[PDB]
Amino acid sequence: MRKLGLIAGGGALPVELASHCEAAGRAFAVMRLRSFADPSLDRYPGADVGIGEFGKIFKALRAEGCDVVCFAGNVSRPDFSALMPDARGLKVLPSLIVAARKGDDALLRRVLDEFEKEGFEIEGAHEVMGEMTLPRGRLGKVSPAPEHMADIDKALDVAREIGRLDIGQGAVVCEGLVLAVEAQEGTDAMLRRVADLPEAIRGRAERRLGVLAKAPKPIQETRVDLPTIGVATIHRAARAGLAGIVGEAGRLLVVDREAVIAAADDLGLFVLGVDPQ
Amino acid sequence: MRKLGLIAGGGALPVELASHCEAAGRAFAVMRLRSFADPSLDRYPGADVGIGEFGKIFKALRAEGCDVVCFAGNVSRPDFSALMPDARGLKVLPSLIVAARKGDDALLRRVLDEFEKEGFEIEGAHEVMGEMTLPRGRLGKVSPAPEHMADIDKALDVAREIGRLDIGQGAVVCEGLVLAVEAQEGTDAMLRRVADLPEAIRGRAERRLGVLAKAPKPIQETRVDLPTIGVATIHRAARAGLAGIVGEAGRLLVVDREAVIAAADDLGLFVLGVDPQ
Ligand SMILES: CCCCCCCCCCC[C@@H](O)CC(=O)N[C@H]1[C@@H](OP(=O)(O)O)O[C@H](CO)[C@@H](O)[C@@H]1OC(=O)C[C@H](O)CCCCCCCCCCC
Ligand SMILES: CCCCCCCCCCC[C@@H](O)CC(=O)N[C@H]1[C@@H](OP(=O)(O)O)O[C@H](CO)[C@@H](O)[C@@H]1OC(=O)C[C@H](O)CCCCCCCCCCC
Ligand SMILES: [Mg+2]
Ligand SMILES: [Mg+2]
């Protein structure tokens, strides 16, 4: 996982991105564009730079060891007279004004040419999310078996009806039997209480049965964060003799992706991203 | 609690009654009327008597130390020639034939006069249930406070929506916060996991908050038993700093009523029966 240089313009997108990055445990820093970046970003490591202190931005970008950057947020073309660039900066400035004369698009494009020529890999907001969340389909080497399809389907739309009822975000289904429903206790606790059920209605570590599904509750006016998967999640779900874990393909954060994949792989669990709706 | 002499005619009523009696831990015996009583009653302590081996029935009734009887099930008037009474029996027989000449009602009534004159307290099926289940309103000395009304209302219709979803039969609500939802793990386990939540979102043993509601799932073609309340239920709900417990007034079995009342009373919990629907 490349460390991210989040270049933050105005609005709520970079803010969401930062939080999700920190939840996923992904490494980053924030380049907060003066007068654009929302102040609730000052809490993250990084730097407050004006446009176009390009010299400064490359400086801090390398200073944080970012090799990939994402540009997220509202930015409008500036005043080119009132601009107070550093000397890098002033070097780039005319190239900008030419492109600017051709339109915002050519201008934005020109800015990116510079970061590429400098040179950092450029990523879009969607791809940043994509790489931290579930994929579509298996995450590790283990796939589900036809036996598990049954539970996978009902694990989810149960876990969704829980969410619709503003309760918890998780549910464990084994052979059609809802064994466990999350609400307020955390997923670890639930997976423990499941390991504790009679092996009769349960899966076995030898022969595994049953599926953990964890799905996000529907959006709100209040900001909404995504459900998460830990390495300890893989641990306890294995100890419950569960066959695998599942969630909506974009809508679930994986904390330490590498580590999670290795637990699931070593223990025989599948982890599955599922097409939303 | 008077020990019950369940006098079992045909059909599924006495069967249900026996099971509920045994779930409530209430003392009983079954007088299984030959050719009437369903054979799944042979498992319970008691006796197989024909009508009208009255001598036998009084004998075994006392032999089980029953001082109250309930007549439950289908019975039709018999053949009075083909009847093989014992000598008690034959003594009573004519009194019966007189009443029988006035109608089934007078006949049934006459039978009851005999058990009363013998003499056992006669109870109806409904009253038998009533005395084992919740009442309507408080069960013990403790009442709910106005503060608790909030949770009481939502504890229940949550616990009902769980039941509608064929999951578990219980739910714990505190200050509007669903803390816990039962499914497959038993109520004891849930009440433990609740005692384990942060005291921040929880009630305190000093100042109590929150309510356990446990409600029956909707009827089925398959026979349906009632949710139950234990003394350990009172224990753990107290240890979770809950203010009280609640259920539908007829629709919840109390196991060791005396003992439960004394736990709730000594610990400061209310236990509340609520009008169904
Ligand atoms: C110190 C050095 C700092 C260097 C400054 C770098 C700032 C670059 C500008 C970043 C804007 C970028 O975050 C916006 C963006 O990408 N959005 C694309 C997206 O559409 P949205 O609906 O707006 O989400 O998806 C679309 C595709 O589906 C796509 O087309 C949208 O692109 C735009 O939003 C267009 C821009 O909003 C137009 C503004 C151009 C940049 C103006 C300022 C240029 C920098 C000044 C340099 C001196
Ligand atoms: C060894 C000694 C054994 C002695 C034998 C004792 C057997 C007594 C008969 C028991 C019948 C009783 O269980 C039924 C009953 O109570 N039901 C009442 C109830 O209505 P349901 O809709 O039927 O539930 O609620 C109604 C009120 O809302 C009420 O009216 C219904 O009463 C009846 O069901 C009427 C009976 O079904 C009619 C039958 C009379 C008894 C016939 C056999 C008499 C015993 C033979 C003695 C030799
Ligand atoms: Mg982009
Ligand atoms: Mg009666």
Classify the phi-psi angles of B16: left when phi > 0, otherwise alpha if psi is within -120 to 50, otherwise beta: alpha
Angle at A121 between CA A118 and CA A127, to 5 degrees: 155
Data resolution in angstroms:
2.9
Q: Report the C-alpha gap between B175 and B250 in whole angstroms.
A: 26
Contact A55, A86 (CB under 8 A): yes
Tell me the β-bridge partners of B29.
B5
Identify the DSSP state of A52: T
Q: Is A182 helix (H, G, I), strand (E, B) or coil?
A: coil
Which residues of chain A does CATH 3.40.50.20 include?
2-127
Q: Report the C-alpha gap between B140 and B190 in whole angstroms.
A: 23
**A161 chain-B contacts, CB cut-off 8 A:** 165
Considering only CA atoms, which of B176, B169, B177, B213 is closest in space to residue B197?
Answer: B177
Considering only CA atoms, which of A228, A274, A257, A261 is closest in space to residue A140?
Answer: A261
Angle at A145 between CA A176 and CA A153, to 5 degrees: 40
Considering only CA atoms, which of A179, A183, A222 is closest in space to residue A197?
Answer: A179
Phi, psi of B185 (to 5 degrees): -110, -10
* Contact A78 CB / ligand 1 (< 6 Å): yes
Give residue for tokens 């809802």. Answer: A178
Q: What length is written for chain B?
A: 277
Give residue for tokens 């080497």. Answer: A141
Query: Is the Cα dihedral A14, A16, A19, A20 positive or negative?
Result: negative
Which residues of chain B does CATH 3.40.140.80 include?
128-277
Contact at CB, B158 and A168, closer than 8 angstroms:
no
CATH of A2-127, one of 3.40.50.300, 1.10.10.10, 3.20.20.80, 3.40.50.20: 3.40.50.20
- A242 min Cα distance to partner chain B (Å): 16
- B198 min Cα distance to partner chain A (Å): 9
Contact B114, B69 (CB under 8 A): no
Contact at CB, B179 and A178, closer than 8 angstroms:
no
Considering only CA atoms, which of A268, A136, A116, A114 is closest in space to residue A205?
Answer: A268
Chain A: residue nearest B178 by CA? A167
Please provide the CATH number assigned to the domain covering A128-277: 3.40.140.80
Q: Report the C-alpha gap between A216 and A239 in whole angstroms.
A: 24
Instruction: Report the Cα–Cα distance between both ends of chain A, in Å, rounded.
Output: 29
Q: Report the C-alpha gap between A196 and A108 in whole angstroms.
A: 57
Contact A226, A251 (CB under 8 A): yes
Number of H helices, E strands in chain A: 9, 13
Q: What length is written for chain A?
A: 277
Contact A36, A12 (CB under 8 A): no
Considering only CA atoms, which of B222, B177, B226, B181 is closest in space to residue B202?
Answer: B177
Give residue for tokens 């939080």. Answer: A19
Contact at CB, B178 and A201, closer than 8 angstroms:
no
